Amino acid sequence: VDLRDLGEPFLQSFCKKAATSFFDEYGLVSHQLNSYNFFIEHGLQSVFESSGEMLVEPYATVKFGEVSVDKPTLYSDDKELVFLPWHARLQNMTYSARMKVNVDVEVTQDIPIGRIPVMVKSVLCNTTEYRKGECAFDQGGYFVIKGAEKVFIAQEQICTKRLWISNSPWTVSYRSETKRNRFIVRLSENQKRKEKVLTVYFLSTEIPVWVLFFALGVASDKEAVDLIAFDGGDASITNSVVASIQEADSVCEDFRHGRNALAYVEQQIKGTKFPPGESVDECLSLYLFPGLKSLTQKARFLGYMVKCLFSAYAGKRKCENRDNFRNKRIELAGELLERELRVHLAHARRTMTKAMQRHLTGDGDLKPIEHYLDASIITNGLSRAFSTGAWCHPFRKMERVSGVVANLGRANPLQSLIDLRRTRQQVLYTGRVGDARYPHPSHWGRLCFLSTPDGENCGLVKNLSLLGLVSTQIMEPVVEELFDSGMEELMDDTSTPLSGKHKVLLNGDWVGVCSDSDYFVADLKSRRRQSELPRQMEIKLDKDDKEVRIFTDAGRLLRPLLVVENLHKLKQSKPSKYTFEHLLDQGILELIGIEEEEDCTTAWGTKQLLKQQKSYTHCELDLSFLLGVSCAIVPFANHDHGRRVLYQSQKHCQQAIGFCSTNPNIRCDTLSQQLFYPQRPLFKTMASECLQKDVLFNGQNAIVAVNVHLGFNQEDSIVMNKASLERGMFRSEQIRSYKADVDSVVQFGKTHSKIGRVDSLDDDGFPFVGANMHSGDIVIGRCTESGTDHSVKLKHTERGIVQKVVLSSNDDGKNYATVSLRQVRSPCLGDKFSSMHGQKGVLGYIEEQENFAFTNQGIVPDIVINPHAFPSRQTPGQLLEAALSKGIACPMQKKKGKSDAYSKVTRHATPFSTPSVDDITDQLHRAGFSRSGNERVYNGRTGEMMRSLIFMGPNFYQRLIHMSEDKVKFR
């Protein structure tokens, strides 16, 4: 079926509807909530059962049963009160739930074991069901630890479900969960001029690999070099294998005879430091390649490992670099909380046994189990790790990493949005890394390559793309449904060769072979598009390595794409606005990971690339969804220099003053700022049309002229209008909170005197609502009894009118008070501003209205900037936005005189699919203006027609939080 008859605008409308359905179904914080939900539903039980039972012997055995968690409640009275996160914020409490486990001890009841912090809007939050306590602008995903809001930064680790080939001694390595599972094959010289030989580092014991071959059960050297499968030639490979044979014979005397090699690995394993409590046969069935059944299969896997090393040696295979994100997994709340809970669960069990072992020697006299287990160990450890930032090291024991838990910012809703979507590569000494600080081509579609910090964390902290998803673990077994597509068993004879067949690997474990690989993969992918295989299953066909890799584990980065061959199923459908589930269930869309995307030809978003030539398998939804949430909304963002886009999307949008909250009566933040009249931009990108949010933009639409103003706007200064400021442009409200606490001696009181300045205080020690407090006054009166008090005084620049006074208490007996002060500011002569293209500057002059230069309708500018700023900063997009916006706020003069005068109006400016300049200038020409964007203006002080034409138009400007009256200091 041709796709030409579907048409291009139909496909654009479908792309917009499909992205809108994505954002309705998933939101922007699904990657935090899904991970926490998986930890509560599954991973908690896996921790408490994988920990295992134990028996103290000076016998008494204990076993952990099933684990239950119940909703957060308050026991202030002996009533059970519902506990909401705003209660936890205002009372300086931690918002947490109780965990119960039922133990079984024999030498049986339910014991409380700790409190775990609850993520807001998760399955344990009481706000999941204009409720009292909620803001409309808020989504979940944060924690309230001791009254403060914290977030997890996702941690990147290497993928340990594959083999890693180095080249420093030419190593190939297998890793797993257990530290007793590490397996290394090395190709080196353990010594003139020895030939390079093969060595095994298993259980901290160097063994020749030929001995391990005959220990696992192989009979002949010819079938051992069949297990390696040299692919012929390559005299270095033949030299290394005959050197390893005649070096195996130089260590054991006739290892090929019955159980000689097995006795050798007995006496080689057992002589180490800390030998394992096992014979070698149970050592092989336990610690050698977990997931394989027979020793035949372990010999086959060792031959495959040696083949991989020899293929990397000859230059036919590449070494793994850890900057390619197909070798990385991403750890979020479940993966980190499991690791943190295992430490304090072990610390609880360890101080349980040495407390029981006294009273057990001491006759039964055994207590109930709630005595021998302290519950505050887990509770204190989790909250200490949240409130200090020191998590546990991923693989070092007894160590602690530091870049894990961050503070949640609430300056505008966009700063809170981008603080929840970050990713980090932690490094040892910051300042000597490889290509970690740079964009790699495997970031495409999943991490933003334009926005990143510029300090020490430049490039090490990444931002998720808009349509990016983090996968989760699949709990159903998948290996038995692989046989239905043409996969066959891995037999046990170690004598049959397997040439021509491709190997299949499920999470790194070899489970079978397949003869035809270009039918196996295409049938698995067809069964995934009809919802009888899981949607997060990654299938990669590898022609050079002759291999089929399948991944079902957690931590992979996914994104949706159109499936071209199922794309004709829209015509026959109905264009009612879709669900995402219905488009997934018909095979029109797919979720695709980084490794599968290497087998994909994707058209560049543009339907005109797709439908002018059909040599493609997929197509993007939009190219601007390659960027993060603060970079995809920037107009003409591919028209500016990259340092400027970085300035806008990482720094200046977090500092703008706009929306703050919709329920400010229960928010006692340190600083809260807000505009009087926030506006939205005139232009419409694709991401802003798809998310349908207004709080992504924080600023005003100011009319900007580009002109010199008596030398007052040099060196990146700006000139503003006095009358536009008096009518309320950029007028700001600011609320500051001053807090104090006492025990429940020092108390709150009037302090009985005027040691500072006490005018507005009542008997309780707090002022009245509506008081006008001045610098030098006393805001909170903590009268120590019989004098010698410690009150709180306003500093030398802290003013305001009292907005509210809040009195809170704790559960452990501590009182808190908070007083909020309201100020109203219009811009003064050193306040800081910036456009949406990285052109920051300071206000240097405020001009009267009748002194400004004016047009033939009487329009004067609000902001005047210098023309020396444009040839040098490389931000031409600021001229193209202003020329577009002026075209869409003007009336169409109707030279045609038809009905639909405003039908063909251009207003998008989406990145990577911007309008051309002929469309922008034709839009300006239809509105009655010159195409070049400038217009004649009269001089305001003398009245004469000025000789130069001036560029004018509306730009979205932002008022930043750096204000002049806060920078004044004197020593």
Binding site: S220, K222, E223, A235, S236, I245, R256
Partner: protein
């Protein structure tokens, strides 16, 4: 290329006897000898644009005035001579002087 033992299936090392020129093969696990099919006992593989170009030498064929030069010699002529070759990819022709 290595060859394996006929009855034990193990690697054969050359055990050319003293009294006779046979170049036998033998096994370090069983007792079995065999005269070799091939008389090569060790074949091994080894090995497991930075030359100056001119500025202003015109070409008699093309319009390109850069023709990369090098001192070489021929098989009957003792002593060296300078050889030119024009640098355009469609040209590729070499000439003395």
């Amino acid at each position: 290329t290595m060859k394996f033992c006929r009855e034990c299936n193990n690697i054969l090392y050359p055990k050319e006897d003293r009294e006779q020129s046979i170049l036998l093969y033998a096994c370090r696990n069983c007792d079995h000898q065999e005269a070799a099919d091939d008389n090569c006992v060790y074949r091994n593989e080894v090995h497991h644009p930075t030359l100056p170009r001119t500025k202003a030498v015109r070409c008699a064929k093309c319009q390109h005035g850069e023709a990369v030069f090098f001192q070489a010699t021929a098989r009957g002529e003792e002593g060296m001579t300078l050889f030119f070759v024009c640098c355009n990819p469609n040209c590729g022709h070499r000439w003395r002087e």
